[PDB]
Amino acid sequence: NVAPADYVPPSPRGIRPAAWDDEFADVVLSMSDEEIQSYLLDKLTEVIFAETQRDGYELRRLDFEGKPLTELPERRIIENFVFEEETLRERVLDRVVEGVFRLVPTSTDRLELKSVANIIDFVLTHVTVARKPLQHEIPEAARTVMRSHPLQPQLGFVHALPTDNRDAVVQEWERMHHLDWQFGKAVYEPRSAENERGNLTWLREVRHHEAREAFQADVDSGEARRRHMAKIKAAAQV
Amino acid sequence: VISYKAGDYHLVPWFRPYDLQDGCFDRDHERLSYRFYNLETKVIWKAFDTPELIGMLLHDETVKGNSGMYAPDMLDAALHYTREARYWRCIGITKPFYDRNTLRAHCWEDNGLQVGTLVMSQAMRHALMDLERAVRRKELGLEPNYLWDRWGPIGFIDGARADYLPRFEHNPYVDPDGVDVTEIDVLPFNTHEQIRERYRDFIEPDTAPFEEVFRSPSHGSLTTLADIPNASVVALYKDLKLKAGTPVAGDAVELAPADVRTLFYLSANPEWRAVADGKASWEEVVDAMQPVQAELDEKIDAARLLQNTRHNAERVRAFFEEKCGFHDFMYTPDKTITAAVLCYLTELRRICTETAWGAALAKCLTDMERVQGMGRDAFLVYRHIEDAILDKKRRLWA
Amino acid sequence: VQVPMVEAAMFEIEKDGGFDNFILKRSGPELRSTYGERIRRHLLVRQKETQKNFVLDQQAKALAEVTQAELMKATSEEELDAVLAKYGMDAEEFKRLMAKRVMEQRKSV
Amino acid sequence: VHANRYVDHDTYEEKYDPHWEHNAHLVPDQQFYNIPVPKEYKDAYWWRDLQARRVQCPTEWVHFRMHTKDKLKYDFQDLAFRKKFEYSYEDVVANAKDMCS
Amino acid sequence: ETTPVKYVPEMLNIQNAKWWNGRGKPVYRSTYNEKSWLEKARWGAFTKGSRPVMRQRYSAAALKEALEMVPEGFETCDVPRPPQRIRAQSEGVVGRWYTNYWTLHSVRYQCQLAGVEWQFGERQ
Amino acid sequence: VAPWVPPPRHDVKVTMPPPPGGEVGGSYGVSTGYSDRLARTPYWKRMALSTYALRMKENETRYPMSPHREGEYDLRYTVTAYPDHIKHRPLLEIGEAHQIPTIEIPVIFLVNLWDEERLTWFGRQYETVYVNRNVAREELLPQRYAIYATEEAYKLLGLPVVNHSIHEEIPKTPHAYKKLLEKQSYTEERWKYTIEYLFRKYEADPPELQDK
RNA sequence: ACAAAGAGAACGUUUAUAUGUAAUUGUACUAUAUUU
């Protein structure tokens, strides 16, 4: 189980839910993609243990005094909790997923929405599709400092990667195993900054850039124009 | 400076985001494709197989965000096909479509040079046997036993397995009467309006006997004890029963009349009616003193139609068992379920544009957005009704 | 990166500077392997990027100077946003870093 | 053809690099005439180069051009069993009379 | 696979000639061995031993004008005799013909007969 | 089939034909070079596009050596077009044992690595030290604490480029190694040998016969 | 085949070493010794 051939990407593109409204107070869910679940992890915690143990269950860890020993039942079970009971799912669905988020599901959803271990994914989706997309604007006054530099990047290299796409059932095995840097295979994650220590393709570019300075300086002084004419003076002598 | 002890570092150690397609249509035509070639047939794909759930996908596709679903220009279609997607479903057709565009029941007899008559399959001309055999018995005087009225959801309701239309040529259908039919019988009956005419009633779903049970507040698993004030109202009703004509103290547990069990709820949760009836103890007053709570029963009932017909068939089955009065859904007649759905869609095409609130009552998705849009006070009680419908199954769940 | 190599290619690396040169120095028929393509087409694209992240900084230190002068006008810290807004830089993370500057510096005290 | 292509800032497109077509190592191909690649990524295509030079026949069918004394009059780099230039019989006449030998 | 294939069946000199049993060369042998094993066996036609490497013989004034190409200060000792395996060659008088040992000590000989004076050194 | 048979490798000259492959990067197997463009070009043309000064500059001879493969014999004039076989031999001979001893390689140090156990610097920044091979392979190189002391990183690191004979020959024998050690002791301690280290022997040899 | 050497022995390999009969083999001063 890796790819169902239409595996929807997280898609952070910003299309807001119908009743999301002012982002449901926006700023309340303009929180980092885990701070979003941070409220979930206390909400979903509350969705048990005086939500169903208040009426119809027994999960508080008994002790020598006939009492909940642990503060709450083992939160591991809370995370992987299968609400296989229809209404007892709804009774824990009218609280956290539909209480606050207004994330109306489809029959398909609630059919897949079996355990909150999976339903966390569902609530992560809509907020992420409600996550307003970045406004990629550049003040032109800032561009002319970019659009004037002598040094510009090449910006065509990703296409020079060794193409790997095939049946991707074995594109996940490489994770649990140590095999993705095997036999010349290598994953490529584009970055912005490199380690300046020991990167022989970084330092080698510095002593190329730091030479482009000593040259460029020698155009300002007006000598490259002198020795470019020193040759011609020695070229037209006869 | 860095410290390395050494002998260290040991170098080697699917939910779809439901987006409205209005933002996707670059033009006008490719929208009409998504409307018809992607959603209309999806209604016809249910209008043929089982319209009992045609109102469930509506809530689902509304989550994905299409605009004009509940608007009539689907119901003006759905209500049409959900009748004749039976007319040909009982001729014998299995797949409703001959291609993407046309209907399986419209590929005419001649390849394309025909006007009105349709090429039948051996399933048809063998499913038209039980029709024409039902005709002879309808003229014989004996019981016109329509074998395809014993059919239902999981087949023949009688615990009997159902034979298939291309019957083996060595097992001809045993006829206890003796009226034999064969290919020469169903030969001349081929054109639609020359076959719609002969045996209309036997195929027409009977919506008249179930014209409306939907504009009347009903309940699934509620009794006379069923209440949130399990001490205030249920004992007040004793004070309503000892005070009623022909009084009996509230010493029994037999549910009150259906239409009045919701009247408990207008006075159960609303702590205004829980004291506006908290002082008055007559039986005549608890049903009469609330005109307002009865002038807005439509806004109370409709929300019990939509919300209980959206989420899962396990509700829509239950809901078709609550209203139309079934024991189970699986052991049911085919035509009457076509009736039960008809009335569910006869009203859905008036509930939208008539009732201004009903329009956004159905286009909406969340429970809250309807309250903020539609009648809130009619919902504070309706939410309680919904809070109570499961509170009796909850003990049955324990 | 675990490629299989001979007893001798373990020594061709040291005298060549590492695993980058020993691949790019040889060429095709010289480096007969087919792993010497899965990995060479990786160093090349990884070096072509390293020289992009670099110019990305000389394009950035260039943008610092046209701000360092524009940042000198400290008449009001509320028009400091307009100092960065002219260059599109977001005031939040800047003063935040400048608020780290009050701790990231005074951690070495 | 989209590698090492400077992109212009405002337009967001590959501005024309007149120097690009000269660092180009034209790789042969069977569906396309020749595909120009930047020199730096040429070494992944050293085989399809040696497979394009090779006479498209198996050698054993053009073996007759390799065993006899036409070995000297035939190119054989990368098994390209192609003929070398040969003077005509009328040219070798004039090209040896104009030396009056 | 500890070893891919040990004891390959070619080690027995299996006569797989294309005219004999129909199989061509084994795949390990190259399909075009440019020169046969006889041409690599006769060094006599390959190494100059009592053999006239330089075909061309120049006149008297033709050798008073190849010497005009030797650079100033060149000694005929620095140019060493090529090894065995390098075929003894002479392309004639070309650019820096002097550095070609065989051409040098053959143009030198044609100067011994043609009276011209070999101004540079000996084979010290 | 082949649309557009590719051109030869190095036909840059205008008169002389290109050198054989491999020499310029290709497939060994011919000791000649044939540019069909050069032959089909007639003589009056081939002599037109050049001058006498230039003709004597591509007829140029390197006979004992190759003009393209540095340090390599002219594989136009060898016995066979294939690259040399003795100056290219592998590590182990046909019947010799894999007795390649412990080799130590130099690496410039980019970090003042301070060993916890000895409180001793492996080395300061910009300091080339002969360390064990796997340490430099698995410990010092992955953590960016050092780089291989090739004679081109001495230039990148603003260092003075000093020779180390770094695996020039791989000494297959402990004698072959303990001799290669005696070579760097000549490169890094040249003045130790140029003359006497310090002739203790010939300066007042019995001087402490006197004065206690 | 195993162990040994060799490589800071994650393993791939090349030398030096006596194991099983693994398993095939075969075993009637001029003298006067010797070829088993």
PDB file of N, CA and C in Angstrom, chain E residues 30 32-35 40 43 46 69 82-83 85-89 91 93-97 99-100 102, chain F residues 16 29-32 52 55-57 59-64 73-74 76-82 86:
ATOM      1  N   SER E  30      37.220  -9.889 -28.716  1.00  0.00           N
ATOM      2  CA  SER E  30      36.637  -8.754 -29.414  1.00  0.00           C
ATOM      3  C   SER E  30      36.249  -9.141 -30.832  1.00  0.00           C
ATOM      4  N   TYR E  32      36.350  -7.410 -33.495  1.00  0.00           N
ATOM      5  CA  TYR E  32      37.256  -6.896 -34.517  1.00  0.00           C
ATOM      6  C   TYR E  32      38.649  -6.786 -33.924  1.00  0.00           C
ATOM      7  N   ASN E  33      39.406  -7.870 -33.993  1.00  0.00           N
ATOM      8  CA  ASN E  33      40.823  -7.811 -33.668  1.00  0.00           C
ATOM      9  C   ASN E  33      41.533  -7.292 -34.906  1.00  0.00           C
ATOM     10  N   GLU E  34      41.868  -6.000 -34.895  1.00  0.00           N
ATOM     11  CA  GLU E  34      42.277  -5.303 -36.110  1.00  0.00           C
ATOM     12  C   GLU E  34      43.364  -6.051 -36.862  1.00  0.00           C
ATOM     13  N   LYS E  35      44.452  -6.384 -36.182  1.00  0.00           N
ATOM     14  CA  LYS E  35      45.559  -7.102 -36.793  1.00  0.00           C
ATOM     15  C   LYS E  35      45.668  -8.488 -36.178  1.00  0.00           C
ATOM     16  N   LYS E  40      51.386  -9.266 -34.801  1.00  0.00           N
ATOM     17  CA  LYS E  40      51.988  -8.950 -33.516  1.00  0.00           C
ATOM     18  C   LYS E  40      53.085  -9.927 -33.130  1.00  0.00           C
ATOM     19  N   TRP E  43      58.116  -8.923 -34.997  1.00  0.00           N
ATOM     20  CA  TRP E  43      58.639  -7.605 -34.683  1.00  0.00           C
ATOM     21  C   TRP E  43      59.532  -7.055 -35.782  1.00  0.00           C
ATOM     22  N   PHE E  46      58.154  -4.449 -37.581  1.00  0.00           N
ATOM     23  CA  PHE E  46      57.590  -3.554 -36.587  1.00  0.00           C
ATOM     24  C   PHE E  46      58.635  -2.741 -35.854  1.00  0.00           C
ATOM     25  N   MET E  69      65.152  24.331 -39.634  1.00  0.00           N
ATOM     26  CA  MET E  69      64.016  24.199 -38.740  1.00  0.00           C
ATOM     27  C   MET E  69      64.410  23.785 -37.330  1.00  0.00           C
ATOM     28  N   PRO E  82      62.987   5.560 -28.794  1.00  0.00           N
ATOM     29  CA  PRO E  82      61.706   5.065 -28.313  1.00  0.00           C
ATOM     30  C   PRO E  82      61.826   3.630 -27.842  1.00  0.00           C
ATOM     31  N   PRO E  83      60.894   3.154 -27.042  1.00  0.00           N
ATOM     32  CA  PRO E  83      61.012   1.789 -26.527  1.00  0.00           C
ATOM     33  C   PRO E  83      60.769   0.746 -27.600  1.00  0.00           C
ATOM     34  N   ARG E  85      58.100  -1.543 -27.871  1.00  0.00           N
ATOM     35  CA  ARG E  85      56.721  -1.726 -28.304  1.00  0.00           C
ATOM     36  C   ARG E  85      56.226  -0.609 -29.203  1.00  0.00           C
ATOM     37  N   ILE E  86      56.876   0.545 -29.199  1.00  0.00           N
ATOM     38  CA  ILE E  86      56.497   1.617 -30.107  1.00  0.00           C
ATOM     39  C   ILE E  86      57.066   1.304 -31.482  1.00  0.00           C
ATOM     40  N   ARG E  87      56.186   1.184 -32.469  1.00  0.00           N
ATOM     41  CA  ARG E  87      56.608   0.888 -33.829  1.00  0.00           C
ATOM     42  C   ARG E  87      57.546   1.965 -34.345  1.00  0.00           C
ATOM     43  N   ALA E  88      58.654   1.544 -34.950  1.00  0.00           N
ATOM     44  CA  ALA E  88      59.618   2.489 -35.501  1.00  0.00           C
ATOM     45  C   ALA E  88      59.020   3.189 -36.713  1.00  0.00           C
ATOM     46  N   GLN E  89      58.858   4.502 -36.615  1.00  0.00           N
ATOM     47  CA  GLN E  89      58.133   5.281 -37.601  1.00  0.00           C
ATOM     48  C   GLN E  89      58.996   6.433 -38.086  1.00  0.00           C
ATOM     49  N   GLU E  91      57.599   9.940 -40.362  1.00  0.00           N
ATOM     50  CA  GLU E  91      56.599  10.583 -41.202  1.00  0.00           C
ATOM     51  C   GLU E  91      57.204  11.506 -42.246  1.00  0.00           C
ATOM     52  N   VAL E  93      59.850  14.769 -43.176  1.00  0.00           N
ATOM     53  CA  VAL E  93      60.212  16.029 -42.541  1.00  0.00           C
ATOM     54  C   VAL E  93      58.927  16.813 -42.310  1.00  0.00           C
ATOM     55  N   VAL E  94      58.570  16.997 -41.043  1.00  0.00           N
ATOM     56  CA  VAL E  94      57.363  17.693 -40.636  1.00  0.00           C
ATOM     57  C   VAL E  94      57.709  18.611 -39.471  1.00  0.00           C
ATOM     58  N   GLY E  95      56.689  19.265 -38.926  1.00  0.00           N
ATOM     59  CA  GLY E  95      56.872  20.108 -37.765  1.00  0.00           C
ATOM     60  C   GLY E  95      57.548  19.377 -36.626  1.00  0.00           C
ATOM     61  N   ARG E  96      58.710  19.870 -36.215  1.00  0.00           N
ATOM     62  CA  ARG E  96      59.500  19.255 -35.152  1.00  0.00           C
ATOM     63  C   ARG E  96      59.832  17.807 -35.485  1.00  0.00           C
ATOM     64  N   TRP E  97      60.249  17.584 -36.726  1.00  0.00           N
ATOM     65  CA  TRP E  97      60.810  16.303 -37.129  1.00  0.00           C
ATOM     66  C   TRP E  97      62.023  15.912 -36.299  1.00  0.00           C
ATOM     67  N   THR E  99      62.509  15.989 -33.035  1.00  0.00           N
ATOM     68  CA  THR E  99      62.196  15.241 -31.825  1.00  0.00           C
ATOM     69  C   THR E  99      61.867  13.783 -32.112  1.00  0.00           C
ATOM     70  N   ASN E 100      61.535  13.449 -33.354  1.00  0.00           N
ATOM     71  CA  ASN E 100      61.324  12.063 -33.759  1.00  0.00           C
ATOM     72  C   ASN E 100      62.685  11.410 -33.942  1.00  0.00           C
ATOM     73  N   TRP E 102      63.880   8.478 -34.916  1.00  0.00           N
ATOM     74  CA  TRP E 102      64.214   7.775 -36.150  1.00  0.00           C
ATOM     75  C   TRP E 102      64.429   8.742 -37.301  1.00  0.00           C
TER      76      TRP E 102
ATOM     77  N   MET F  16      45.716  17.219 -41.448  1.00  0.00           N
ATOM     78  CA  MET F  16      45.955  15.859 -41.002  1.00  0.00           C
ATOM     79  C   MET F  16      44.674  15.237 -40.452  1.00  0.00           C
ATOM     80  N   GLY F  29      40.829   0.077 -30.841  1.00  0.00           N
ATOM     81  CA  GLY F  29      40.658  -0.956 -31.839  1.00  0.00           C
ATOM     82  C   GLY F  29      41.134  -0.609 -33.231  1.00  0.00           C
ATOM     83  N   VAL F  30      41.519   0.640 -33.464  1.00  0.00           N
ATOM     84  CA  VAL F  30      42.138   1.029 -34.723  1.00  0.00           C
ATOM     85  C   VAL F  30      43.332   1.919 -34.426  1.00  0.00           C
ATOM     86  N   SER F  31      44.392   1.752 -35.210  1.00  0.00           N
ATOM     87  CA  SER F  31      45.587   2.570 -35.084  1.00  0.00           C
ATOM     88  C   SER F  31      45.648   3.691 -36.110  1.00  0.00           C
ATOM     89  N   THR F  32      44.544   3.983 -36.784  1.00  0.00           N
ATOM     90  CA  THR F  32      44.485   5.060 -37.755  1.00  0.00           C
ATOM     91  C   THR F  32      43.385   6.034 -37.380  1.00  0.00           C
ATOM     92  N   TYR F  52      51.709  27.648 -44.700  1.00  0.00           N
ATOM     93  CA  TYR F  52      52.880  26.823 -44.432  1.00  0.00           C
ATOM     94  C   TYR F  52      53.228  26.816 -42.951  1.00  0.00           C
ATOM     95  N   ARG F  55      50.730  24.363 -41.574  1.00  0.00           N
ATOM     96  CA  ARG F  55      50.915  22.982 -42.003  1.00  0.00           C
ATOM     97  C   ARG F  55      51.987  22.290 -41.173  1.00  0.00           C
ATOM     98  N   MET F  56      53.062  23.001 -40.849  1.00  0.00           N
ATOM     99  CA  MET F  56      54.081  22.480 -39.951  1.00  0.00           C
ATOM    100  C   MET F  56      53.645  22.503 -38.496  1.00  0.00           C
ATOM    101  N   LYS F  57      52.380  22.812 -38.227  1.00  0.00           N
ATOM    102  CA  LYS F  57      51.865  22.836 -36.870  1.00  0.00           C
ATOM    103  C   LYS F  57      50.700  21.888 -36.646  1.00  0.00           C
ATOM    104  N   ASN F  59      50.961  18.757 -38.908  1.00  0.00           N
ATOM    105  CA  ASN F  59      51.837  17.619 -39.140  1.00  0.00           C
ATOM    106  C   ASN F  59      52.710  17.335 -37.939  1.00  0.00           C
ATOM    107  N   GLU F  60      52.553  18.117 -36.877  1.00  0.00           N
ATOM    108  CA  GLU F  60      53.438  18.056 -35.730  1.00  0.00           C
ATOM    109  C   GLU F  60      53.513  16.639 -35.184  1.00  0.00           C
ATOM    110  N   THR F  61      54.712  16.234 -34.775  1.00  0.00           N
ATOM    111  CA  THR F  61      54.940  14.882 -34.292  1.00  0.00           C
ATOM    112  C   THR F  61      55.197  14.873 -32.792  1.00  0.00           C
ATOM    113  N   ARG F  62      54.683  13.837 -32.132  1.00  0.00           N
ATOM    114  CA  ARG F  62      54.955  13.544 -30.732  1.00  0.00           C
ATOM    115  C   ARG F  62      55.407  12.101 -30.586  1.00  0.00           C
ATOM    116  N   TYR F  63      56.029  11.566 -31.638  1.00  0.00           N
ATOM    117  CA  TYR F  63      56.095  10.128 -31.902  1.00  0.00           C
ATOM    118  C   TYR F  63      56.244   9.249 -30.667  1.00  0.00           C
ATOM    119  N   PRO F  64      57.187   9.477 -29.752  1.00  0.00           N
ATOM    120  CA  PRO F  64      57.256   8.605 -28.577  1.00  0.00           C
ATOM    121  C   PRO F  64      56.141   8.830 -27.570  1.00  0.00           C
ATOM    122  N   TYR F  73      51.940   6.648 -24.214  1.00  0.00           N
ATOM    123  CA  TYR F  73      52.545   6.421 -25.516  1.00  0.00           C
ATOM    124  C   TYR F  73      51.519   6.627 -26.623  1.00  0.00           C
ATOM    125  N   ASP F  74      52.021   6.887 -27.824  1.00  0.00           N
ATOM    126  CA  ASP F  74      51.162   7.192 -28.962  1.00  0.00           C
ATOM    127  C   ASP F  74      50.481   5.912 -29.397  1.00  0.00           C
ATOM    128  N   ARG F  76      48.703   5.346 -31.599  1.00  0.00           N
ATOM    129  CA  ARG F  76      48.759   5.143 -33.034  1.00  0.00           C
ATOM    130  C   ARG F  76      49.968   4.304 -33.421  1.00  0.00           C
ATOM    131  N   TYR F  77      51.033   4.348 -32.621  1.00  0.00           N
ATOM    132  CA  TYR F  77      52.294   3.693 -32.942  1.00  0.00           C
ATOM    133  C   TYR F  77      52.617   2.527 -32.024  1.00  0.00           C
ATOM    134  N   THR F  78      51.688   2.110 -31.176  1.00  0.00           N
ATOM    135  CA  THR F  78      51.913   0.934 -30.356  1.00  0.00           C
ATOM    136  C   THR F  78      51.627  -0.326 -31.168  1.00  0.00           C
ATOM    137  N   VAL F  79      51.833  -1.489 -30.545  1.00  0.00           N
ATOM    138  CA  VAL F  79      51.545  -2.747 -31.229  1.00  0.00           C
ATOM    139  C   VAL F  79      50.057  -2.872 -31.495  1.00  0.00           C
ATOM    140  N   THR F  80      49.240  -2.495 -30.521  1.00  0.00           N
ATOM    141  CA  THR F  80      47.798  -2.597 -30.627  1.00  0.00           C
ATOM    142  C   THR F  80      47.162  -1.310 -30.132  1.00  0.00           C
ATOM    143  N   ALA F  81      46.017  -0.977 -30.717  1.00  0.00           N
ATOM    144  CA  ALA F  81      45.326   0.261 -30.400  1.00  0.00           C
ATOM    145  C   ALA F  81      44.801   0.313 -28.975  1.00  0.00           C
ATOM    146  N   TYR F  82      44.993  -0.669 -28.213  1.00  0.00           N
ATOM    147  CA  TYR F  82      44.398  -0.584 -26.894  1.00  0.00           C
ATOM    148  C   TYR F  82      45.344   0.127 -25.938  1.00  0.00           C
ATOM    149  N   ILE F  86      50.863  -2.593 -19.113  1.00  0.00           N
ATOM    150  CA  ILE F  86      51.777  -2.749 -17.988  1.00  0.00           C
ATOM    151  C   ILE F  86      51.734  -1.525 -17.083  1.00  0.00           C
TER     152      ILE F  86
END
